[PDB]
Amino acid sequence: WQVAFIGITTGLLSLATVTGNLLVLISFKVNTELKTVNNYFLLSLACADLIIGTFSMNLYTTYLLMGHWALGTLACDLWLALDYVASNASVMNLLLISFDRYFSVTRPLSYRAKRTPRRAALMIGLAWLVSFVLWAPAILFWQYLERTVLAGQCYIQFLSQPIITFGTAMAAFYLPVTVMCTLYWRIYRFRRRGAEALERAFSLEDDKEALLAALDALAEAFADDAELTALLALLRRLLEDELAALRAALTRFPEFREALLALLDRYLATRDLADARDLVWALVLAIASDPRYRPAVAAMIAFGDAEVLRAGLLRGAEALGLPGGEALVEEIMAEAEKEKKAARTLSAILLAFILTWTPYNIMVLVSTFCKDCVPETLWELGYWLCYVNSTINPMCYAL
Numbered sequence: 001w002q003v004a005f006i007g008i009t010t011g012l013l014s015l016a017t018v019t020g021n022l023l024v025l026i027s028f029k030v031n032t033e034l035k036t037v038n039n040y041f042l043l044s045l046a047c048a049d050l051i052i053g054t055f056s057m058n059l060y061t062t063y064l065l066m067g068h069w070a071l072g073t074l075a076c077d078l079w080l081a082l083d084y085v086a087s088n089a090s091v092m093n094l095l096l097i098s099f100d101r102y103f104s105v106t107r108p109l110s111y112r113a114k115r116t117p118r119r120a121a122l123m124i125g126l127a128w129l130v131s132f133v134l135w136a137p138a139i140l141f142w143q144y145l146e147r148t149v150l151a152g153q154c155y156i157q158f159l160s161q162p163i164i165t166f167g168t169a170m171a172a173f174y175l176p177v178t179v180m181c182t183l184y185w186r187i188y189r190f191r192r193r194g195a196e197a198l199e200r201a202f203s204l205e206d207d208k209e210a211l212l213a214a215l216d217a218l219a220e221a222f223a224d225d226a227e228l229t230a231l232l233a234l235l236r237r238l239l240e241d242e243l244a245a246l247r248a249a250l251t252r253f254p255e256f257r258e259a260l261l262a263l264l265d266r267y268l269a270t271r272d273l274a275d276a277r278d279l280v281w282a283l284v285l286a287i288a289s290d291p292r293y294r295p296a297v298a299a300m301i302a303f304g305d306a307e308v309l310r311a312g313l314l315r316g317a318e319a320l321g322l323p324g325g326e327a328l329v330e331e332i333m334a335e336a337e338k339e340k341k342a343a344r345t346l347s348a349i350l351l352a353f354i355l356t357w358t359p360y361n362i363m364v365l366v367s368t369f370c371k372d373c374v375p376e377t378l379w380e381l382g383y384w385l386c387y388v389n390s391t392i393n394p395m396c397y398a399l
């Protein structure tokens with residue numbers, strides 16, 4: 001009764017883990033569209049979750065119910081090598097996606113030509129090899145450093161100390177989760193500055209300070225370029241001489257920038273207080289309609305793009321005058337919705353990670369502060385919950 005209740009739940013759950021893992025991996029070779037950099041990291045995540053669903057969850061619950069595996073299975077070393085290697089290659093892949101999106105939102109042009117489907121192979125391989133040299137040599141050959149599995153019923157030999165366990169908890173969950181949460185602070189507040197500025201520039205037409213804030217947000221976005229940052233700074237200082245060089249920065253990437261000069265003249269020869277907002281929006285639209293700047297703006301039009309930014313970009317296109325700008329705006333917001341889906345997927349995986357690893361982590365923190373604080377059943381629930389993250393991961397992509 002009690003034994004069969006647990007076993008049924010994790011037997012069907014393991015099937016959902018590996019079926020989704022097997023389906024997505026063969027889907028990369030089925031459709032040649034899911035090999036891109038953004039989805040390449042998901043491939044490594046899927047391989048890791050496949051490993052820890054095939055060889056870690058099943059054996060974990062088999063140990064938990066049929067306690068006949070304690071100190072009786074010599075494949076436990078391989079099982080935990082795969083376990084820790086896949087778990088760490090999922091943690092490092094989560095932080096690698098976090099750093100990749102932070103550098104694609106704050107350095108989106110240095111990373112434009114530095115994030116291709118061939119450098120993804122190198123980045124993913126470096127992450128996987130780092131996880132390997134961390135765990136697989138260690139988890140396996142630490143015993144040789146006690147030839148048998150050192151007193152190991154199923155567990156890992158070198159994770160036996162409160163300080164060592166706390167250090168792993170920090171450097172794998174704690175420190176990475178705070179790091180990711182810091183880049184999420186930066187990215188969320190950055191996209192929020194962009195969205196609030198571009199909304200006060202659309203919901204208010206008499207606030208020249210909101211326009212300055214929008215230009216400052218764009219400069220914080222487009223800081224890699226000398227030309228673009230110089231143009232934004234000059235446009236901010238124009239309203240907040242050497243204005244001849246201003247058109248040199250405007251005519252440095254002229255594809256449809258002919259109307260940019262006309263808008264600049266109209267907004268700087270009439271001492272405009274609101275036509276500068278139209279100029280800023282036309283500049284944003286022109287930047288968006290570029291093969292290199294599209295992800296840069298698309299990242300910032302991910303968060304606040306409910307209603308305000310669609311209207312803002314539409315007004316900018318209507319002021320720019322592009323013959324066919326509606327299709328360009330539709331494509332730009334399609335890219336923005338793709339960025340929104342990617343960000344929501346990142347948030348879902350991060351929240352599942354934090355909602356399934358925290359409990360174990362929290363109990364690890366209190367395992368050095370009055371150690372006798374939680375019973376064995378709560379610990380087992382937390383440890384199994386950590387594996388539940390693998391089950392959700394294919395479902396995160398599918399939704």
Ligand SMILES: CN1[C@@H]2CC[C@H]1C[C@H](OC(=O)[C@H](CO)c1ccccc1)C2
Nearest residue numbers: 084087088091168169172173357386387
């Ligand atoms: C031990 N298993 C269960 C399920 C997967 C793995 C990790 C979870 O435990 C942790 O979070 C540690 C850090 O303390 C850790 C160790 C290796 C890599 C990343 C993170 C619990």
